[PDB]
Design a protein that fits this description.
homotetramer; binds magnesium ion; EC 4.1.2.55 (chains A, B, C, D); 8 strands; Aldolase_TIM (chains A, B, C, D); 2-dehydro-3-deoxy-phosphogluconate/2-dehydro-3-deoxy-6-phosphogalactonate aldolase (chains A, B, C, D); lyase (chains A, B, C, D); 2-dehydro-3-deoxy-phosphogluconate aldolase activity (chains A, B, C, D); TIM Barrel; eight-stranded parallel barrel
């Protein structure tokens, strides 16, 4: 049961990526039980990162671990291809991309051709990043049956949808990307790619371990807490909230996100800490 | 009644922008009655264009006309600010941006702050580009009441939604961006920003003129034809279809779009021409 | 350009239909220029009415006029058929039905069979009542080409959707059901079936006559005020608000709606009346 | 972990409910391990049933068992109240209702008042039937904190939505209604109210018992086959397919559904039976 972290990309006050905080943060997650790192995913501001930034994120993480899934999506297939050729030169877990996005009403064959070109050029295992709420498109198994897919990261609240990939694509690994369904994913899928692993890795790791021991109720109870957190963070902007919580829960600074993904202001950050305090107490009591 | 064209960005077979075709195309549209050009909009592959490409599009068009609305949106407010400072040095109609996109569940204050920063730095009239089907966010008048908005381009099938801007924001110009509602927009709003002006400008211009003369039925009949075209193009990918039709209807080449906005293949292009032929006949009979 | 009214169904405080009030109201409506009355539509609480209540509404109204379109939808086709046979013996304009509702994921063929059965038994002109937002289903022209459809009431905010019927179904009368698009419908379709005709019939009849005279600015001005009323009524429940407003604008009691469509409390009614006061004065200053 | 069955309502070819078939079916279901029967739910064509048909279903079933949850929803609260007073004199598990439906844009307070009225008169435990996809409304815990709710059936694909009830409503029993999430519900909620219990009760009772024994791999394997059945039944209409399958799997006639919920034709029934043959053999090879 794989616990993958869509690692955040630390930015400094001027919006420049801080590769040193990225490395510090990555080491801590690995050390705390995270099995692999999804680089440049939604949580790492993927589509907000230029091609050079995506590449620099992979280079910096490659010093910490080779268990990296490199997300290379952009609205210019040339830049996507460039990153792929670059990644073929490295020893990583695989390359990934979300579907084309923004543009509405694109034919389905456009989605199929995009990935088909990634597969033609890549020498790495293909990981499909399916996030309909973000891209506006759901990638069905129809399209994937041709491609040499190794894994699918499915950010979707419908578990049967994730499970349908398992069913229709023998051999492919499926991981659900929702924080509020971790428990369920660990009881049916090949793992999770959950953003909350950035600030509470030991908690998600504890869920997996409790499930391996057969203590579901303990795992479920931890999910209640995770879900209550989810509700609180929505108000402040989840991704921007995570930056604050990584400092609070893990003891080191990971900077700020980059606008339009606005950082929480000091009044907002303090308001968040006050509001999650009761949940933090409960968590650190059941996990440590 | 303003007829604005979200001009396409011509790309060559290698995906490099062709500024010469852009200039040729722009001259023809102006010559045929288009009042202003929306640069780097959805139809011009805005979010697919790098900041340098957005700038090069404005520079090239600035030789043809100063009636330019410069769209500068990207998922890095620094790059957005850069383009804005650059545009303040020029004599244009204004600067515009769609809302932040891709990232779902961003607080509303994030949308308000993004535009508020554009307004703080820009010395040009602010044009709000509202396209919910593409960005995932609807920009309500609540947020715009603070900002110094000159115009709103509202791509939305609900005309009452566009008309609500008119109502709630005295003095602001509102233009609807739907091809299938042109007729209605010309009878209630300040104009249109319609993608179909790229290949049938004389037709949309004719609608406005027939309406100024009081010949609504003639304008409406032209809308029937436009709508039938809309249905046919959806199948092939509207934006990609437009590139083919600009050659067919206007007699000059505007290249191809850039993948993931895939160009129509030769079999698809011929299939499109065969399928719209009856509509072209009818159009050129009522317009010339 | 026709103005059809989806007349409300007056109920007394015990949830019993008030036939006397229904007749007095219809009488006023026809006198004020309403072209026809649509019985048991959404505004008349159609699906909340029993077989017999639908029947007794037609009977009550048949003592007042012959310009009636009889909606007979329910989730038991046997009951729909009974109502159809009942109306076959009456000299009214036509019979109508919205699509099956509530049940999600019903195959399209079910929608076709529902209507084919109505057409097979009805000796009256068929009126299709399309209200996707209420039923969860959109009736496409595909299905309608097989049926002897005379008219379509399309309650849809996409005016292009209503306009598409005109194109694919030659000779069929198309009316749009939105109050916020009345102006546009009178400029392109066969008419409107708007709930607001219940309390401001003269206003909508004035829009029709002003447009007939080429005074579009004055008709659009009235539309702006209608759309402002629409925003206000949503807080209170539109159908429920209409009852209070009929009394307020027309001078007679039309009773109360029947819960789950709750009547406005005394307090809510005064609140409503205060909000619309400024709009009522501007309206009564332009109409008459 | 409880397995509640939303029992279908058998109709004869004339659209008359077949009480004898209803009793024979319920009898088999209880014998096969079903914990309780939910009467007049969606699967039982609840909203398509008249006041009297709902009543006669409860009466028929009351001669067979006392484990009945009585759903009484209609769009006339007077009728809902009558049904509630009727059931007050019967020794059943509880009374239930889905939210008002059809009418869009009804204020939330209407939903609260609908339920407050039921609670004010019912002398039975209250069961909230939440089915946003059918009614167009989601009942939030906000409303439920004021009511003496004993249970909630949540037909929702977001398992997190069902789980949120457990959190905000201590002591309330929560069941999920999806067939495709049965496995997950049995691992986190109080049970399931799944339509498939009608034709494969032993399969779902087996999942419950396997999970009770810690054999999750075997319960998930059965879930995979259930989800494949779900895909197949959608083509034909799930509720309508269930009738054919009950006969096929259980050995007795449960008649036909009543149109607009059309029965499968002879041809469609054979087609359905062929598609599910491979799945039936794999199922009957794992159950018994
Ligand atoms: Mg009579
Ligand atoms: Mg008895």
């Amino acid at each position: 049961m794989e616990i993958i972290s869509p690692i955040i990309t630390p930015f400094d006050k001027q919006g420049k990526v801080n590769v040193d905080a990225l490395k510090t943060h990555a080491k801590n997650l690995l050390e705390k039980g995270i099995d692999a790192i999804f680089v440049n995913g939604t949580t790492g501001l993927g589509p907000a990162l230029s091609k050079d930034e995506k590449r620099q994120n992979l280079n910096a993480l490659y010093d910490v671990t080779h268990k990296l899934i490199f997300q290379v999506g952009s609205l210019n297939l040339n830049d996507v291809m460039e990153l792929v050729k670059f990644s073929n030169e490295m020893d990583i877990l695989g390359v990934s991309s979300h579907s084309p996005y923004y543009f509405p009403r694109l034919p389905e064959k456009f989605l199929a051709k995009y990935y088909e070109e990634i597969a033609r050029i890549s020498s790495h295992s293909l990981y499909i990043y399916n996030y309909p709420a973000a891209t506006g498109y759901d990638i069905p198994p129809s399209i994937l049956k041709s491609l040499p897919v190794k894994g699918i990261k499915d950010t979707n609240q419908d578990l049967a949808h994730s499970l349908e990939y398992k069913l229709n694509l023998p051999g492919v690994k499926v991981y659900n990307g929702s924080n509020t369904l971790i428990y369920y994913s660990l009881l049916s899928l090949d793992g999770v790619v959950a953003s909350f692993t950035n600030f509470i890795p030991e908690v998600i790791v504890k869920q997996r371990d409790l499930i391996k021991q057969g203590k579901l109720d303990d795992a479920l109870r931890l999910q209640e807490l995770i879900n209550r957190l989810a509700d609180i963070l929505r108000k402040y902007g989840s991704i921007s909230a995570i930056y604050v919580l990584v400092n609070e829960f893990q003891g080191y600074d990971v900077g700020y996100p980059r606008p339009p993904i606005f950082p929480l202001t000091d009044e907002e950050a303090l308001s968040l800490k006050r509001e999650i305090e009761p949940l933090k107490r409960k968590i650190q009591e059941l996990v440590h």
